[PDB]
Every structure is written in C-alpha cells, then in structure tokens.
Amino acid sequence: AMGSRVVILFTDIEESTALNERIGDRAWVKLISSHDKLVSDLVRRQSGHVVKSQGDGFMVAFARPEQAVRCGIELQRALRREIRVRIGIHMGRSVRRGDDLFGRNVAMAARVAAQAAGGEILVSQPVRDALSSDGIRFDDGREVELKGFSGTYRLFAVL
Amino acid sequence: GAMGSRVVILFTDIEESTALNERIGDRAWVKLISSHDKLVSDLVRRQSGHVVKSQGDGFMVAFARPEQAVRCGIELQRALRRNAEIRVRIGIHMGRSVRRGDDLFGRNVAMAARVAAQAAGGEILVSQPVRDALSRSDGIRFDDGREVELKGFSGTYRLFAVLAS
Numbered sequence: 379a380m381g382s383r384v385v386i387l388f389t390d391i392e393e394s395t396a397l398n399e400r401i402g403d404r405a406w407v408k409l410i411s412s413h414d415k416l417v418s419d420l421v422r423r424q425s426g427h428v429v430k431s432q433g434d435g436f437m438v439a440f441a442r443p444e445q446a447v448r449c450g451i452e453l454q455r456a457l458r459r460e461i462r463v464r465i466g467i468h469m470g471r472s473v474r475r476g477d478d479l480f481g482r483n484v485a486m487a488a489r490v491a492a493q494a495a496g497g498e499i500l501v502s503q504p505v506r507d508a509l510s511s512d513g514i515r516f517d518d519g520r521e522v523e524l525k526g527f528s529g530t531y532r533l534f535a536v537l
Numbered sequence: 538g539a540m541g542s543r544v545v546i547l548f549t550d551i552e553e554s555t556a557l558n559e560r561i562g563d564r565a566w567v568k569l570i571s572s573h574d575k576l577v578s579d580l581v582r583r584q585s586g587h588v589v590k591s592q593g594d595g596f597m598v599a600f601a602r603p604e605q606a607v608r609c610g611i612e613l614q615r616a617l618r619r620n621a622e623i624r625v626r627i628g629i630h631m632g633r634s635v636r637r638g639d640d641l642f643g644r645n646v647a648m649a650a651r652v653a654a655q656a657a658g659g660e661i662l663v664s665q666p667v668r669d670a671l672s673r674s675d676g677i678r679f680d681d682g683r684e685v686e687l688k689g690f691s692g693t694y695r696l697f698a699v700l701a702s
C-alpha cells in the first residue's frame with residue numbers, strides 16, 4: 379500500500395432511505411443537517427478531519443487510531459441520547475490526492491464499516507494491535523470475507 | 538410550493554474496483570482514477586452538468602435536463618469502449634431535491650443511487666420518469682424496461698436501459 383499512514387473511519391446510518399421515505403424530505407434534511415453538525419463536532423474533538431459525506435455517512439481521517447475510536451465511542455453515546463449508525467475503522471498507508479484519499483486501505487476501511495452492525499464500532503486487526511493503556515477494550519473478533527480482497531480478516535468490536 | 542428544485546442526478550460506479558486496486562497496486566490505481574476523473578469531468582462539462590462529488594470509484598453528477606444526463610452517459614460508455622479495462626455502471630433519475638452548499642439531499646438522490654446500483658457494468662439505466670421525459674427524443678432509444686424493487690423504497694419500479702447508436 380502506498381502513501382502516508384492514516385486512520386480512516388466510515389460512518390453509515392442504517393436504513394436511512396426508508397427513514398427518509400417515512401418522514402419525508404423536509405424532516406430528512408433537518409435530521410441530516412443536525413447529524414452533520416454532531417459528527418463534525420465530535421470529529422474535531424479528536425483532531426480528525428471529515429474528507430467527504432455520502433449524505434447519511436462520513437469518511438473521516440485521523441492521525442492516530444485512538445482518536446478515531448474515541449470519536450466513534452462518543453458518536454455512539456451521543457446517538458443513544460431515532461437513528462442507528464455503523465462505524466468501521468482501519469489504518470494503513472493511503473495516497474493523498476487533493477483533499478481525498480485513495481488506495482486499497484481506503485477500500486478496506488469502507489468494507490470494515492459495511493460489516494459493522496448498527497450501533498457497533500468495528501476495527502481491523504492493525505487498529506486493534508495498535509491499541510491497548512488507551513482506555514479501550516475489544517471483543518475477541520470475528521473472521522470474515524470482504525468483497526474485493528482475497529484474505530479473510532478478523533474484525534474487532536469496541537466494547 | 539414543493540420542497541426542492543428539479544434536477545437530474547446521475548451516479549457512476551466502477552465494477553469491482555477493489556479487486557482492480559488490489560491487482561494493479563495503489564500507484565497504478567491512483568493514475569487510473571485520476572484519468573477517469575478527468576474523462577468524466579470533461580464529458581459532464583460538455584453537457585453543462587456539474588460533478589457534485591467523487592465517491593472513490595465513481596461520481597455523483599447533477600444536470601438541469603434529462604437529455605444532457607443521458608447524452609453524458611452515452612458518451613462516457615463510448616469513451617470507455619474506446620479506451621478498452623474498467624466497466625462502469627450508470628444510473629439516472631430525475632425529480633426534486635434539496636440543495637445544501639454544493640450537495641443535494643432527499644429521497645430522489647437516494648433513488649438515483651439505487652438506479653445506478655441496479656445497472657450492470659457497461660449499462661446505463663434510467664428511471665421511468667427519465668424514460669418518459671425522453672419519449673420524444675429523435676436519437677435516444679430505450680429497451681422496454683424491467684421491474685425491480687429498490688432498497689429503501691416501497692413497491693416496484695421499472696428501469697430502462699439506454700440503447701445507443
């Protein structure tokens with residue numbers, strides 16, 4: 379993998395299209411505007427940078443894995459206080475192109491988030507291995523196949 | 538009056554881009570996507586459209602009128618053929634959507650995304666309202682459509698493939 383080491387976090391609201399259809403566009407745009415503000419504030423708290431939005435989810439860059447995980451922990455807490463979000467985190471080298479990130483580790487991060495349940499923070503093995511002392515605990519992981527990748531990958535939920 | 542303004546939204550997406558990336562390596566991938574970005578941007582510009590955002594291996598694009606969106610898709614599939622190896626799915630839907638900065642929000646954005654997701658590599662699919670708006674086109678031709686259900690939406694939708702000359 380090429381480029382600089384970065385931690386990439388993806389959020390994704392569960393079943394947001396059905397929600398949009400149920401409440402209508404007026405209520406949806408109000409909901410997502412508030413969600414954007416929330417995510418943006420919590421990202422900034424852990425020194426992250428939002429790269430882009432898919433409307434109901436964000437791609438976010440952090441320098442350190444504990445920053446990303448803490449952001450995720452705070453987001454889940456805030457949401458608990460109705461939408462559910464899945465969060466995936468991976469780290470590794472990726473290529474900076476403009477203000478965007480490219481490469482297999484970006485795709486890997488997206489695939490990890492896709493595996494996450496609503497309300498769950500899932501991290502890849504390298505993220506798990508990099509943490510411990512940081513006030514963060516994990517489960518024992520689950521091995522899964524990821525589309526586009528040849529391996530099987532053990533993904534760890536934050537407890 | 539209705540919430541949101543009329544716009545035609547086109548999504549593109551490279552088929553199996555992750556496997557491609559893994560095969561060719563990040564250096565080659567960045568070169569490829571850089572080239573792809575420029576091709577799409579140029580073709581969108583020629584039809585007076587606007588690229589809203591990049592989604593890594595595809596784009597969200599806005600146009601004022603459906604003929605422009607469809608023409609853009611036709612030229613892109615044409616250009617990709619000439620270049621050929623990447624296959625791109627294209628989906629087009631039209632309706633009202635809410636503007637926020639340079640982005641667009643609402644259910645019709647989600648519908649356009651799902652129309653693109655139903656499309657095969659190398660195919661351009663459009664929703665019925667796009668097909669219906671272009672019933673009078675002397676150049677744009679469609680198949681007879683196929684019925685689908687779209688993630689998040691109730692009921693059935695008929696999606697139509699563009700048949701290019």
Ligand SMILES: C[C@H]1O[C@@H](n2cnc3c(N)ncnc32)C[C@@H]1OP(=O)(O)OP(=O)(O)OP(=O)(O)O
Pocket residue numbers: 390391392393394395396431432433434597640641642643646647648650688689
């Ligand atoms: C909301 C659904 O439509 C897509 N979408 C909507 N607005 C935008 C936008 N401005 N930019 C980009 N994409 C947009 C993103 C999202 O897709 P999904 O996440 O696939 O929909 P849903 O949340 O219904 O499905 P799951 O997450 O449950 O699979």
Ligand SMILES: C[C@H]1O[C@@H](n2cnc3c(N)ncnc32)C[C@@H]1OP(=O)(O)OP(=O)(O)OP(=O)(O)O
Pocket residue numbers: 437478479480481484485486488489525526550551552553554555556591592593594
């Ligand atoms: C695996 C997912 O990663 C997405 N991705 C890669 N780079 C970026 C980026 N810079 N910004 C946003 N998203 C990015 C694109 C890819 O999505 P898919 O299109 O779901 O993956 P693939 O093309 O592998 O499979 P199909 O389209 O065949 O499902």
Ligand SMILES: [Ca+2]
Pocket residue numbers: 390391392393394434435
């Ligand atoms: Ca979602």
Ligand SMILES: [Ca+2]
Pocket residue numbers: 550551552553554594
């Ligand atoms: Ca793709």
Ligand SMILES: [Ca+2]
Pocket residue numbers: 651652654655686687688
């Ligand atoms: Ca669908």
Ligand SMILES: [Mg+2]
Pocket residue numbers: 390
């Ligand atoms: Mg999604």
Ligand SMILES: [Mg+2]
Pocket residue numbers: 550551592593594595
């Ligand atoms: Mg894509």
Ligand SMILES: [Mg+2]
Pocket residue numbers: 686687688689690691692
């Ligand atoms: Mg449906």
